[PDB]
Amino acid sequence: GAMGMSPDTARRFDTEFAPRIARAIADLLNHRAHTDVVGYGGHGHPTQVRIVAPHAEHVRGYAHPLNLALTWNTDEIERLMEADGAARFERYLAALPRKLAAWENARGVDFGSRTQADALVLLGGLDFEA
């Protein structure tokens, strides 16, 4: 039926929502990290936003630069197409500072230090709930 398995659905996320997240995060971190959206590049290429923070100028400790890959459940992405879906997205933006701080403490990541004590921080199964 009408579920989020359309190349139009994926495009909508890539064009409307994904750049909004990337730019919001980059600006929130005062450009301490460069954000790049892996857009929809054909069937089999999922959309996801990477947040990278290289060039550790005044930070020395862990030998791992910030490389975060944010991914979200396609069901939730499907919901974004609805009116309450946009409302879901708006709620997620309001909780950016909250989830960000949560990830720092839990995932061993420090955005201010532009470094991490992990090997690589991949975040899957995320939703736009807050």
Nearest by Cα to 108 from 119, 98, 92: 119
Which residues face 61 on adjacent strands? none
| Angle at 14 (CA atoms; ends 114, 87), nearest 5 degrees | 90
Report yes or no: 116 and 109 within 8 Å, Cβ to Cβ. yes
CA dist 129 and 61 (Å) reads: 34
Q: Largest Cα–Cα distance in the chain?
A: 54
SS3 22: helix
Query: What phi-psi label fits residue 39: left (phi over 0), alpha (psi between -120 and 50 degrees) or beta?
Result: beta
Cβ count near 108 (within 10 Å): 14
CA dist 58 and 81 (Å) reads: 43
